[PDB]
Amino acid sequence: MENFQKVEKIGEGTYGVVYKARNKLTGEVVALKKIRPSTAIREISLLKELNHPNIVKLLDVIHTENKLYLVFEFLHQDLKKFMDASALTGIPLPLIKSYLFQLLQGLAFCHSHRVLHRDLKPQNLLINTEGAIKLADFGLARAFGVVVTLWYRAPEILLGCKYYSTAVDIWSLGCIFAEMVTRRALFPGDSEIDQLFRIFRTLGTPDEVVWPGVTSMPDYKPSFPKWARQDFSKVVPPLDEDGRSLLSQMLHYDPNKRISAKAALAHPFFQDVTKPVPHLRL
């Protein structure tokens, strides 16, 4: 890229290396991701039309010299770093609520346009000095697909379901909501089965009563141990009942019972939502 002036490599992103770069002409500072099919090109291109304040803007999709580059609006920090930086004192509840509320607005928008994320995690939630938080990498999993963190994966994906639904994003966001609250990942699995069993150990091994059709899932085994469900009061203390109620609805096993982003925005937990300024050290 002669048009760009690589300011520095900022990591080995999900689909390849990413650099902070400055457009030599416009002078704009952007994030440039070089990706490792005409089908993908078209899908990816469609995402350039997906604009919302809580979605990281995809500025350009460049297919040149038979290589793929994605140009994104730049944000200085991700939620994973912010959480680590806030680990001693914890992110204040008003800011956790503001962030959750904005992320749900972003999801509601994407989902209303039939676009799924599929791989939400703290690392792809970007924040700025003005108190905004934005979802990065929306739609890339589908446009592409085919050590990976499993911590935020919905149980239907772990059980081998081949058709994802918007519910997988709500599950991931519930896991992130819990992590901001407790300052510890909710389900830190280190293998697909450890991930699944960590979920079962906390929410109870699912059965046909709470999840109709679960025993017919591709990777379900009658041999799975049967764990009893624990109480949310023990899961995300000291979160209040409004928060626990919303989290419980975001973590329902049955994707069809899982709350939608639109419905979650109307949950009583957000009655007093505000938009605080975070303490950001850049």
Ligand X SMILES: NC(=O)c1cc([N+](=O)[O-])ccc1NCc1ccc(C(=O)O)cc1
Minimal distance, residue 280 CB to ligand X, in Å: 12
- DSSP assignment of 8-66, as one string? EEEEEETTEEEEEEEETTT--EEEEEEE--HHHHHHHHHGGG---TTB--EEEEEEETT
For ligand X, the binding residue among 35, 55, 68, 126 (CB under 6 A) is 126
Residue 72 lies near ligand X (rule: CB under 6 A): yes
Query: For ligand X, which is the closer residue by CB, 52 or 244?
Result: 52
- Interacting stretch for ligand X, rule CB under 6 A, among 40-48, 70-78, 146-154, 179-187? 70-78
Buried b or exposed e, range 88-100, using 16+ CB within 10 angstroms: eeebeeebbbbbb
Residue 133 parent element (H or E): strand 133-135
59 labelled binding-site residue = no
Contact between 77 and ligand X (CB under 6 A)?
Answer: yes
Residues 16-35 that bind ligand X (CB under 6 A): 18, 20, 31, 33
Contacts of 119 (CB under 8 A, 6+ apart): 14, 137, 141, 152, 172
Helix, strand, coil proportions of the chain in percent (round to 5)? Answer: 35, 15, 45
Q: Is 165 in the site for ligand X (CB under 6 A)?
A: no
Peptide bond into 53 cis (omega under 30): no
- Tell me: is residue 2 an annotated ligand-binding position: no
From 276, 259, 280, select the one nearest 96 (Cα to Cα).
Answer: 276
Query: What does the block give as tokens for 117?
Result: 């994320």
Q: Site for ligand X (CB under 6 A): how many residues?
A: 15
In terms of CB distance, is 35 or 181 closer to ligand X? 35
Q: Per the annotation, does 123 bind a ligand?
A: yes
Q: Which stretch binds ligand X (CB under 6 A): 60-68, 74-82, 100-108, 205-213?
A: 74-82
The smaller minimum CB distance to ligand X, of residues 13 and 255, is found at 13
Residue 74 binds to ligand X (criterion: CB under 6 A):
yes
**Residue placing its CB nearer to ligand X in the complex, 47 or 235:** 47
Largest CA distance in the chain: 61
User: For residues 143 and 258, what is the distance between their CA atoms, to the nearest angstrom?
Assistant: 25
- Active-site positions read 119
Residues in the chain, total: 282
- 122 labeled part of a ligand binding site: yes
Determine which residue in the list 44, 55, 56, 261 makes contact with ligand X, applying CB under 6 A: 56
**Residue 120 interacts with ligand X (CB under 6 A): yes or no:** no
Binding site for ATP: residue ranges?
A: 10-18, 33, 73-75, 78, 121-124, 137
Q: Which residues bind ligand X (CB under 6 A)?
A: 10, 13, 18, 20, 31, 33, 56, 72, 74-78, 126, 136
